[PDB]
Structures are given as structure tokens and as C-alpha cells.
Design a protein around this ligand. Structure first.
Ligand SMILES: Nc1ncnc2c1ncn2[C@@H]1O[C@H](COP(=O)(O)OP(=O)(O)NP(=O)(O)O)[C@@H](O)[C@H]1O
Ligand SMILES: Nc1ncnc2c1ncn2[C@@H]1O[C@H](COP(=O)(O)OP(=O)(O)NP(=O)(O)O)[C@@H](O)[C@H]1O
Ligand SMILES: Nc1ncnc2c1ncn2[C@@H]1O[C@H](COP(=O)(O)OP(=O)(O)NP(=O)(O)O)[C@@H](O)[C@H]1O
Ligand SMILES: Nc1ncnc2c1ncn2[C@@H]1O[C@H](COP(=O)(O)OP(=O)(O)NP(=O)(O)O)[C@@H](O)[C@H]1O
Ligand SMILES: NC(=[NH2+])NCCC[C@H](N)C(=O)O
Ligand SMILES: NC(=[NH2+])NCCC[C@H](N)C(=O)O
Ligand SMILES: NC(=[NH2+])NCCC[C@H](N)C(=O)O
Ligand SMILES: NC(=[NH2+])NCCC[C@H](N)C(=O)O
Ligand SMILES: [Mg+2]
Ligand SMILES: [Mg+2]
Ligand SMILES: [Mg+2]
Ligand SMILES: [Mg+2]
Ligand SMILES: [Mg+2]
Ligand SMILES: [Mg+2]
Lengths: 395, 397, 395, 397
């Protein structure tokens, strides 16, 4: 029916965009809001807002389990830490939102999709490269980037058209079950430290002095499946570790990162459950993956994180890396014990039915099975090519 | 006089090895003890012990500053973390010991060098590849690996040959320590479900002890070298020692790692490296402010490779040497200060400043001073996504 | 029955080894000879020789198709060129020989396997790492390396025990359907050029002046499946291109390579079919694989070739790379036209039903669909981070 | 005087662009023509044409040696082959043109630089990223991409404004050539099942022509720089030109490539680069003789990355610059001679010699002089294979 399908968050800009897009294009607007565990307002209140702001149809998709299962678990399996710091909090959800917006377009006669991203962020890239890969036939509208859009203009438009919207905190927040990101003007200066007011997912790391939390996280083929012996879904694992890590101030990040669009920016993140899961998963790989496979997998972990940050979730390199990763995870099964305390994650135990750790090869005790007679010859040949090079250097 | 040059630590085993090597080879032994900040017994007491055990010469080399400057600083510049966990505590010192043992051989007429490493560790590799690179003419003697030299054989030899040595009780800990960090291996910790207890720690206090007084510290670098702490100029050795103290008081740098040995097996070790972890963390944060994006992405690859080379006994290899040329160029503008809070066993960055910053407030900000030209973005996104879009179209066709 | 299973090539050393191993160990010997297309003597003549030299059982395994399908085709799919020169001629067959020797051990009550490799080559590594991965319970005997073995000693042993064996050319040859390797004393000097006598698989590149051979090689999901429109099996593809490439002197290689055991050595190879197949497969990937996937796949191609050279065919990194490769090959389907002439392979045509080449995006003709309005903005942001770095450098 | 500095090739389009830019901007134009060995019209004829078309100044820079020394030699040292096919013919010259255009701007009071690249090629990127790095104060004008400047608009403008220019017939070939190689694009070859015909070639003869007389050539390097041919000393430019001639006579360096443009599309191009391919082939062979194994493995990674950076318009990027520091160290011992036969369009190596060789005859040989200690091999194999053996055991358990 030649609709515009709007990725709808419930905020001022996308709410005004509904009738603004209607006027600019002459088309009806279907609002699509995704529950990723962002909390705050009930999703029905968001759904209703889009209707009151002129959407012909307004839908909520509960994608929390899908987000955990199909986006967060892959990030865990590639130990994804952008800059070796950031578990891709905002980046991971964008391809999922894209997927559902395309699906909604097929269902509701949409020929255009729209998003409210700005022109100096990464999110525009993640949305628009995604749309171009999944549905190039759809026109993509970026009203906030491409149409001389300002808050004042949006508010003036809302006033002129009696749009029922709240137009009344200096924090720019993005949160979901995987983590929370905070931008504020004060923190754009790199010598300014964050204050307690920036935080929500986590308690101050000083709170629980005599009550550390020791937790055991179990994985089966790279997927988190248990906490302290209790079976859990991936969403439940993330939520429980968000709570337990958050109570210990774990996962507070303060990062200067390279945006794909050419600039550095400073951001604050809270990602307690994510950091516990990625740390544990890494420790389990050290127990279950052979040396040279592990060395190379640190390269593919890094590449994967870059691809997803760079808006290339749907790229063929990312997809092929997933086939590599799936094979590596076959035996990544076992339990990792960590103490959560003081904002810190401290591993102190591992066990695995797929362990490559061999006590008898490692021990000096009576059970020692390592044949040391091999070592002299190994060292001689291991060192030979660089020895020959050194001789030449010195000649 | 065709001497044996012994890498001498002062321990019972290598002490009795001096006398034993003398009888078994008929050669004179020169003991060389290197001060790397291992503490323990005074070096002169160590030096004398070798003499009393039959060494014809016994020397001590104070290499603490050389170690910090020429080994620890390179590790900082490559953010060296083996397994992404371990800043190479025991690995770093080995090439420096090799260098000095070779120098001692040339000066004291040595034709044989000896070490006390075992046959299932990495240190044998680091020593012997080093010797093969720096001085292939020297024969290498490894009594522990190749001639079954044990504590028992040593205690027995010293009693049978009336060697004036005091036999110390056996420790449950296998410990290697220097100014850069401390490594602990115990039988109990060979079981991966056993957690360490407080008795394995020495360099660091439990995080709970000084919990009430978090320590905010500023570390300054110039061209990738640590040069100041809280505004005070320091040498690299002083930087390491001060941050060992301050991080140690906060329980920072406690590591518990299952690592891949080059000799094909996994093993579990405890490390304490408070100063090293503060320096490497701060250095990494400073590179995020001062190195361009794609240079940074590739340097994480070379950082990893460098750590592997040094772990694998390849400090002197031509790839390691060539990576150092790459690293030196990258460090030219790695100058600035990083502010961190040490608390709870954790290092928390909360500030950066740099006269070489690539951060541009006006390009990043949303305030009135915003200079970012957003008109470029639509086109950038179209072309950045185009090759994968074409691939997707083919996939779906 | 506590047998030794010998990897049996039919030569002097392994023939004498049969009764020598029998005396040294007191065990019966099962000889296992693999047909990899090495030609020369009929395989039955080889089988019979082992019996006459004292083997209790002697078997021939015809593994030519298996070698092509399961070892050569993976090498094609990773464009495997060691040193960017050598398509792993001798390296590829070793894991296959290992596989069949282990199988024979299970069938014939073998507790020991034996091979005739020397101590300064790569082949000992490929055999023994393979045995250690597939069957660590088997003792591995290396009589030629570990038992003070010399040709004179072997001949003296044969004389003393009346072993019926030929004990009478200075070439050290290893050949199979994938290629031919030649070692000779004269060529151990790097300023010595090879003479015509070193060659067998290929004609001199000067022969066919006015009769070049244009060939079309077709692939389906990375597997060679046609030549000049004719369907072929992978073995048939290799054999036909060996012939056609060989007639044009294609695939003559002269390489200084790094052995895993620490030394450089000089070797001559003939690999006409292999080089045609790998060249064509590479050209087809340039047509069918997206840019950044191709850039990364050149890294995995190199790593794969190193792993196989280094005796790590069965390693978990190699196996995981195969999962990566399998995904990349999904659309590597199409035909590559090349001229074979003068020792050279010259591509001059491609076609593919899975092509990523878009004529209309590339052309300047009337059909041009490239939107150039995007380019200014792309260049501005692509260049921004290094521009900012340059500004800092210059300040 | 707020001049426009025009990267001037001498072609019809940019010639009329001079006059057109003058009227459209009211600014004076300075034309800068760079001699990179493109041949064709005499540079002074080119220089004069710009003046006749209204340029206030017209200069010619002979950059042939600078190009060989500072751009082609780095490409040789990184064995630069884009797609593992293309030695960057057109990509290499762009940063050198940028440098000279910036220098000309400073000298002649230019505030604007202009180029004639299109919006779907790589050259726009190489020019504009270059300008943004070297001289961000300069405005960049791109008439072809941004102001619809075409041949037709040029032929029309020159007739309407009485411009004293001779209008040459359109070529079916889009050609870019310099001393390093030649690139040809034709409509016919935009179809991937069309083979090139003899008329697309110029730098090289058909391989059949001189088939009866194969050319054996020795190329010598010193620290990775080509310095001799058949014993005769040469400059890098002389090396390139001589091997262009000798390889060209044998049909060497004919390339036909489907490549990935940075702007997201594939395209098909023909190249002729006889001298470049001989030099890069020889340089690679020499590294196999003079660089240690693991250094060589990693350098194939940096070789690939360097070629990508330069293709992608990132010659001036800090990763490229840092890789150059890595490369310089690797080249220290890349000294020696490589003997090849040029014939049949093919380059066939058949000899190497080097005073810095890592080849050791006695370690390799099976003759009586054999020095390889085989007793080390069994142990090496046991430990080399151990981690994958343990993994296999777990897999099978
Ligand atoms: N949960 C969601 N469901 C649907 N669309 C979403 C969701 N989250 C984000 N988006 C889309 O992503 C765009 C960018 O997200 P964001 O950076 O959160 O901007 P916003 O929500 O529009 N403004 P703000 O109130 O500042 O967060 C939004 O404009 C929406 O179009
Ligand atoms: N500071 C040093 N100066 C000289 N040689 C050293 C030094 N530290 C270690 N070595 C050498 O390295 C070998 C292995 O180190 P280590 O594992 O510390 O052995 P050890 O000291 O002999 N045994 P232990 O008493 O248990 O520490 C020693 O046997 C010495 O040969
Ligand atoms: N086709 C095969 N079937 C079985 N075993 C084989 C085969 N090819 C090689 N081998 C084994 O691989 C070992 C090394 O191969 P090679 O280098 O060919 O040595 P050889 O054949 O024993 N001596 P030579 O006559 O010089 O080739 C041989 O000794 C055999 O044990
Ligand atoms: N030798 C040179 N000296 C100066 N500027 C150059 C030179 N070669 C190329 N350029 C610049 O690079 C741009 C693109 O190169 P090219 O593709 O050769 O364009 P053209 O020469 O204008 N068109 P054509 O006549 O078809 O070759 C040219 O328009 C000039 O601006
Ligand atoms: N505060 C925010 N809204 N941040 C959104 C982006 C977060 C992070 N910089 C990313 O690119 O993924
Ligand atoms: N406890 C010890 N002595 N450890 C020494 C070795 C430490 C560490 N595993 C290394 O290889 O460098
Ligand atoms: N002439 C030979 N037998 N060569 C066998 C080995 C060939 C090659 N150097 C490899 O390691 O694979
Ligand atoms: N025919 C041409 N003018 N080609 C110029 C570009 C050549 C090559 N594709 C490059 O990007 O460097
Ligand atoms: Mg929002
Ligand atoms: Mg990493
Ligand atoms: Mg010690
Ligand atoms: Mg043979
Ligand atoms: Mg390669
Ligand atoms: Mg031109």
C-alpha cells in the first residue's frame, strides 16, 4: 500500500517523524518498535504513542530472546571487544532491528523504511548497509540526517500540527539487555571523569566490601547454558549476570574509540553480564582450544568485532567467519568460576569434559608423563632458522 | 681456560651443580648472577656461595635498569599480553641473561654455558635459542634436563663431597620473580578447580585491605616510554617500582592463567604483575588517543605477534627485530597522560590528555562548535556498503 | 597379531626394511602401497616385491580418486601455493598415506607403523604428526632415521639375507598425479640451472610456437567439474590439464623454500594441472567473492598452505579453516578461459551465473548505473582519520 | 593571487577546463604537468597548450627518477601485487602528483587544486585523500565528477569561446601509462568473455614474435634496491626501463585482471608491466634466499597490506608509513643476484647468488659434507605435533 515503515523508538524525534514523513511523502506510516530489554516505558505505551502521533499501524516486536540467542551469543563466541574494550552494546542490536523492519515492510506494504539516526554516528551505517543487503528495493529515509532536521524544527512542527508529545536530563542514553551506553556533553572532554549520575546498570564498585560474589558459568558448545549449576537460556544468563555483576560494579567501561566515520569519540558503557560472559568464554577457550588454533582465533575474534562495529554484520566475510567460529565452538564446553568484586572479574577455577589440559603432562609429581628427551631436539630445530639468520647478520 | 659459565641463581641445585660440573668436566666454573630485582638474599651472599662451592670466579651484574629500559619498555610498547592475559614476566628476562652470559664467556675464557632449566618448560627454549643466535660456538650444558640433575642428587653430592652448603627446606612453591612481576607454580594449583589461597601472593595485598582508600594515579609517556607519575619525572625502572607498590597495595595485577606452552602442553600459573599491568593498560589507552584507526587495528595484530615471539624464545629472531622497527615508528607520537583509579584489584581509566591527541572535540561534539560535515555521510555509507550489497543481491538471486 | 604395518613404496630401502624390521622386532610385516598415480612399475609388481622380500601380507590401495577429491580439491580451494610458489606436491599425499596405514593397522592387527622418511626432511613430520593425531596407540618406527641406516648397510643386509632386490640415475624423484618433485646433487648449488634431463611431466616451453592451447575450466562450488564444456571428475580434470599444460611447458617451478626443520633447500617441481587449476580457481574467486572477503581469504589461503606444509593437515586450525573455506566456496561457480603457451598461463575470459561483476555499474556506456554523487562524501570520510593524523604530524 | 592549480595532463578535457575554470571561478589557473615517462607529446608542447588555453603559468616537472626511486622502489620492496595480480601502475604515481601539486600551490599562490578524475574510479580517492593529508587548507575542485565536465561540454565550450585548441578524435581506449606500466580500459573489454586483441598492447610484443631468442637476464639488488643488470650498474629508473624493453620484447608482464575497486565495484582492466613484473619477481626470489622463514611468512602479510593501502589511496596514511619502517629493516640483507629467463610471456627463475645468503649447502646436502644433525628431528617432531595430538585425542574420546 506504499507505506513508510519507521523504526520507532518512542522518543520525540521519531514520534514527530511519523506525521512529518506523512506530509513530506503523502504516505501512511507503520511504526515498528523492538523490545530489546531497553526497559523504561511499557512497550504498549510506546505502541500507543505512535498511533496518537498519526501512525496508521503500530506494532511491538518482542525480540529479547532472539537478540540474546542470535546476536549476543555470536558476540560471546567471538569474544567481541571492539578496541579490546567494548562488547558492541549498540552495534549488535542494529542488524536485528533492520531484519524486523524489512519483515514488517513485506507484511504491511512498505516500500520505504525510515530511521532516526544522525549523520555523524556509526548507527546510520549499520542500518543503511543492512537495508541495502537485505532489501535494496526499499527506499531508505533518514529524516534526521537528510532533511535539515533540528529539535526546534521538530518541536515547531509538533506545535503547528498539535502532535501529542512530551517536549520537556543532559544524558544521551542507549540501553538494552546487553548493555548501556551514555553520552553527555561533560564527558566530551577527555580529562573529565564520569560522575555517579552517569550509571544505572551497575552499583559503585566500592559497595560490597565483605560480600564478593563467586559465580560459575557453564557453556555447551560455546553457548552459556548454566549458572551455579542451574540451567538457563541465553537471555536468562545475560540478565542474571547483569544483576550479579552490576551489584559488584562490574563492566563499567570508559572508552576512547575510533568511529568508522573517521573520528574518535569518548563514551561510557555499562555491560556487566556481557563482560562476565565474554571473560568466561575466553577462559574456557584457553582450556579447550589447541594453541595455534587459539592464536589464529584471536585474529578472527578481532576481525569479527570490527566487521560488526563497521555495519558489516550481513557481509560475506562476517558470515564466513561464523562458519569458522561454529567449528571452533564444537568442544567449548565446561564451567568457569570467577569472583565478581570491586568492579573486577577474577577467574579462579575451570573444569571441562573436553579439557585439553593434561595434569600428567604438566605435573612434576609422580604421575609425570612428559618425555623430556624430546626437548633438546625440539629446541635445536625450533631455533635453527633464526640462528642461521643471526650468523649471517654477524658475519 | 676453557671455562664453564654458569647462569647462577644462588639456589641449592645450581650451587651444588658448580662443584658437580667441575668434577664431571674437569673444567673451571665461572658463576654469573644477574640482579633483576628478584630480591631475596643479598647478591654478595649469593656471589660468595658460588665461590665456596668451587667457582673460580663469581660475578654479579646489576641489570635492573637495563632490564627495565631495554626489555620491559619494549613489552609496554607492544602491550605484550600472552594469551591476552600475561605480560611475559619470566620470558622477558631470559634474553638479557643470555646476553650477559655470552659477555661473561668472552671475558673469562668460557667455551661452555650452562643453565638449570627443565625439559618441560619454556625457559630452556629462551636460553638455548638465545645462545644459538648470539654465540653458536659455545657448547650448552643443561644438567637438569640432560644429566638428571635433581635436588636429591644435589643434596647427596654435597654430603658425599663435603660441600660447605646449607641445605634449605623444599618450598611448595616454584617461584620466579623480578622487578617486572612474579610467577608462582604449586602442586595444589595444578588442579584447575583449585583456587589460589592468600599464601601464594607476595607482591600484592588482597584487594579488600586498602579498599577504603582508592588510588588515583596519572601515568605519563613520551614516545611510548613511561616518564612520569602524578607529574613527577621517573626512570622506567622507577615507574615500574612505584606502580608495583601502588598497584600492589590495591591488589592490582593478580593473574590466574591457563596458558599454552610452546612445548605443546597447557599449564596453570599464578602471576603478580601490578606495575606491568598498570603500564600496559595506560599505554594502550594512550594509543587509543594518539594512533589513527587503521594503524591501531593492525598494531593489535603486531602486538599479539610480538608477545608470541618473545614467549616462544624468539626475542632475537629477525621477525621480532623487524617488528621493533615498526613499533618504534608507531611510538613517535604516543605522548600524553592517562589517569586511572586503582581499587578492588581493578584498573579503571577515567582521564586522558595529550599534546599529540587525535581526538578532535569539535568534530565529535553536538554543541554549537560542531565542525563535522554530515553531508558526506550518505555517500560514504552508500559506497562502504556497496560491495557487500552486491554480494547480498547475488546471494538472494 | 602384533604386526608392523609398513608404508611401502617399492624402493630399495623400504623393501629391505621388511625383513630388517622382522629381525629387529621379531614381528611379521604387512606392506601397504598406495597408488597416487606415481606411474612407473605396475602396482601389482610392487605388491609382489614386498611378498618376495618377506612381507606376510602385501596390499595395494588405489587412492587416486580419493587423493584428487579429498586432498587436491581442498588445495585448489585454498589456492595453496607454499612460498607463493609450490602447490604442495609431496605434502598433500602424506596425510592420505597416513590415513590408509592406520586403517590397514586396524584391519591387519598392526601395533606398529613404519615409514622410510629421512631425518632432515618435512615428510617425517607429516607422517609422524599424522600418526600421533590419528592413532597415538601405534608405535611409529622410522628405520631410515633412527637406526644408523645407510644404503651400504641396507645392501649388505640384503646380501647377507638373499633379499631379491635391485641394487644397481642421480635424480631423487617423487611424483603423483598432482605433480612431480626432483632433487639432484647438481641443483643443490643455487647458481646451477636445471637441464632438460630433470623434466618428465612437461615439454620444453619452446615447443608449440604456433599451437597455443586455449582451455576453459569450469567449477561448481569451488570444485573443478568441466573442461571445454565436458564434464569431468576432479581426477580427470587434473589428468587432462597435466597433459594439456605439460604439452605447453606449463607448471615448471624452481624454488628455494623454507623447510619446517629450519633450513632452506632448492627443489624443482612440475605441476602443470595443479597450476592451471589453482590459477583458474583464483581468477574465479575474483569474479565471485566480495572485496573484503577476498582480502581476508588471501590470509587464510596462505595459512592453510603453511599448515599443510608443516605437517598439520589434521590440526584443529586446519580443520576449522576448512569450515571457513567451505562457506566461501558456495558461489565459486563459473568458467575461466586461459591460454596455455610458452610455459605460461594467461587468463583471457570469465563467465559465471554467480558473478559479482556488474557491467552497468562499471561501464561508462549509456547503461551506466553508478551514482557518482556518493563519491565525494565517501572520499571525505574514507580519508578523514588519516587526514587528522597527518594534521597532528605536521603541527 | 588565489590561483587554481590544475593537475594538467595535456588532454582535450583538462585543456578546455583551464579556460572554463577561469570564467567559472574568475581565478587564474596554473597548469602543472608531470613527466612520469608517459611519452606521447613532448612536454613543452603540452606546457604551451595550457598557456594557449589561458593558463597564467604553465610548468613541467621531470619526476621520472623521483618516481622510480621513491615510489617504484618501495613497491618492489613490498612485492606489491594488488589482487596478487597488479603492480599498482596508476596507483603509485598519484601520491607523487599530489606532492608536486601542493608544492606548486605554495609557490604560485594557489588556494584551490583541481583534478580531472571521475566519480567511479580509484584515482579520485588517491588524489583527494592525498590533498586532505598534505594540504587540507586547499580547496579541491573536481570538474568531471562534481560539475559534469565532459568531452562534449569541452568541445562545445572551446567552439563557443574561440579557444585555440585542436580537437582530437576520441580513442576507444582509456589509457594511463608511465615508466612503471600501462593500463588499458576499453568498452569491448567490459564484457568478461571478450579476450583482448593485439591492438590493446603497446609496451610489449606478442610472446610469439621473439620466441626463437629467449632472454636470460641477471638482476642484482642491494638492500632491496635494484642496482645491476647482467653485471652492469644501473639507477632504479634505468633498471625499470631496461627490463621494460627486454621483458617487453618477450611479451612479459601482460596482465588481464578483474579487480575490486575501493568504491565497491569490480572492473576488468588490461595491464602491461614488463619491467615491474621482472623486478618484483626477482625481488621475491631474492627474499626467499635472504630472509628467515617466519619473517618471510609474516612479510607476505605486510606485502599484501601495503599493496591494499596504496591501492586504497592511503599512501600517506600512518599505517603505510609504519609498514615502511618494518620493510626498511627487512631489506637490510636483501642483496644478491637473480637469474631469469624471459620467454613466452613468462618469467622463469633459474639461478640465485648472494653474499647474504641464508642457504647453507652443507645443512641441505646429502653429500659427505652434510652437517645436519638428524638426532634432533625425532624430538622436534614429537613436540611440534603434541598440541594437535592432544586435541585429536580429545576429539576422538
Ligand atoms: N528498539 C527500537 N525499535 C525500533 N527502532 C529503534 C529501536 N532502537 C533504535 N531504533 C531506531 O534507531 C534509531 C537511532 O536510535 P537512537 O540513537 O536510540 O535514536 P532515538 O531513539 O531516535 N533518539 P534518543 O531519544 O536520543 O535515543 C532510532 O531513531 C530509531 O529509528
Ligand atoms: N637472576 C639470574 N641470574 C642468572 N641465571 C639465572 C637467573 N634467574 C634464572 N637463571 C637461570 O635460569 C635457570 C632457570 O631459572 P629457575 O627456574 O629460576 O631455576 P633455579 O633458580 O635453578 N630453580 P629455583 O631454585 O626453583 O628457582 C636457572 O637454573 C639459572 O640457570
Ligand atoms: N605411494 C606410497 N605408498 C606407501 N607408502 C609410501 C608411498 N609413497 C611414499 N611412502 C612412504 O613415504 C616414505 C618417504 O617417501 P620417499 O621420499 O618417496 O622415500 P622412498 O620411496 O622410501 N625412497 P625413494 O626411492 O628415494 O623415493 C617412504 O619411505 C614410504 O614409507
Ligand atoms: N602526468 C600528470 N601530470 C599531472 N596531472 C596528471 C598527470 N596524469 C594524470 N593527472 C591528473 O589525474 C587526472 C586523472 O588522470 P586521467 O585518467 O589520465 O585523466 P585525463 O588525462 O584528464 N583523461 P585522458 O585524456 O582520457 O587520459 C587527470 O585529469 C589530471 O588531473
Ligand atoms: N550513547 C549512544 N547512543 N551511543 C550509541 C553508539 C555507541 C557506540 N559508540 C557504538 O558505535 O556502537
Ligand atoms: N613459576 C615459574 N617459575 N614460572 C616460570 C615460567 C612462567 C611463565 N609460564 C613463562 O613461561 O614465562
Ligand atoms: N624430491 C623430493 N623427494 N621431494 C620431497 C619433498 C618436496 C617438498 N620440498 C616438500 O617438502 O613437500
Ligand atoms: N585505464 C586506466 N586509465 N586505468 C587507471 C586505473 C588503473 C587501475 N585500475 C588502478 O586503479 O590503479
Ligand atoms: Mg533511542
Ligand atoms: Mg585481540
Ligand atoms: Mg630461580
Ligand atoms: Mg619414493
Ligand atoms: Mg598470499
Ligand atoms: Mg591521462
Amino acid at each position: 500500500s506504499e507505506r513508510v515503515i519507521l523504526a520507532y523508538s518512542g522518543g520525540l524525534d521519531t514520534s514527530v517523524a511519523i506525521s512529518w514523513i506523512g506530509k513530506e511523502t503523502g504516505r501512511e506510516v507503520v511504526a515498528v518498535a523492538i523490545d530489546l530489554g531497553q526497559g523504561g516505558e511499557d512497550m504498549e505505551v510506546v505502541r500507543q504513542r505512535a498511533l496518537d502521533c498519526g501512525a496508521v499501524e503500530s506494532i511491538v516486536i518482542d525480540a529479547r530472546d532472539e537478540f540474546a540467542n542470535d546476536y549476543c551469543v555470536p558476540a560471546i563466541q567471538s569474544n567481541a571487544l571492539y578496541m579490546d574494550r567494548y562488547p558492541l552494546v549498540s552495534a549488535l542490536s542494529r542488524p536485528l532491528i533492520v531484519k524486523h523492519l524489512v519483515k514488517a515492510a513485506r507484511e504491511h506494504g512498505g516500500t520505504i523504511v525510515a530511521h532516526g539516526c544522525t549523520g555523524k554516528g556509526n548507527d546510520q551505517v549499520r542500518f543503511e548497509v543492512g537495508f541495502a543487503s537485505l532489501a535494496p528495493d526499499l527506499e531508505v529515509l533518514a529524516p534526521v540526517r537528510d532533511y535539515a532536521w533540528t529539535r526546534e524544527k521538530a518541536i515547531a512542527f509538533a506545535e503547528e500540527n498539535n502532535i501529542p508529545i512530551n517536549v520537556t536530563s543532559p544524558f544521551s542514553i542507549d540501553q538494552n539487555v546487553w548493555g548501556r551506553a551514555v553520552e553527555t556533553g561533560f564527558l566530551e572532554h577527555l580529562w573529565n571523569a564520569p560522575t555517579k549520575d552517569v550509571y544505572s546498570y551497575t552499583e559503585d564498585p566500592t559497595v560490597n566490601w565483605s560480600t564478593p560474589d563467586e559465580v560459575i558459568v557453564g557453556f555447551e558448545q560455546g553457548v552459556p547454558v548454566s549458572i551455579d549449576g542451574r540451567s538457563v537460556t541465553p537471555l536468562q544468563a545475560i540478565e542474571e549476570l547483569n544483576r550479579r555483576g552490576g551489584e559488584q560494579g562490574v563492566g563499567r567501561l570508559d572508552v576512547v574509540e575510533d568511529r568508522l566515520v573517521g573520528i574518535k569519540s569518548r563514551e561510557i558503557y555499562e555491560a556487566p553480564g556481557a563482560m562476565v560472559l565474554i571473560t568466561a568464554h575466553t577462559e574456557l577457550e584457553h582450556v579447550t582450544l589447541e594453541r595455534e588454533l587459539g592464536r589464529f582465533k584471536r585474529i578472527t575474534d578481532q576481525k569479527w568485532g570490527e566487521l560488526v562495529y563497521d555495519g558489516l554484520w550481513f557481509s560475506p566475510l562476517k558470515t564466513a567467519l561464523e562458519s569458522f567460529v561454529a567449528k571452533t565452538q564444537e568442544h567449548v564446553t565446561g564451567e568457569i568460576r570467577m569472583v565478581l568484586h570491586g568492579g573486577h572479574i577474577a577467574v579462579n577455577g575451570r573444569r571441562s569434559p573436553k579439557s585439553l589440559y593434561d595434569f600428567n603432562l604438566a605435573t612434576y609429581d609422580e604421575g609425570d608423563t612428559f618425555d623430556q628427551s624430546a626437548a633438546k631436539g625440539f629446541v635445536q630445530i625450533h631455533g635453527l632458522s633464526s640462528s642461521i639468520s643471526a650468523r649471517r647478520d654477524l658475519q
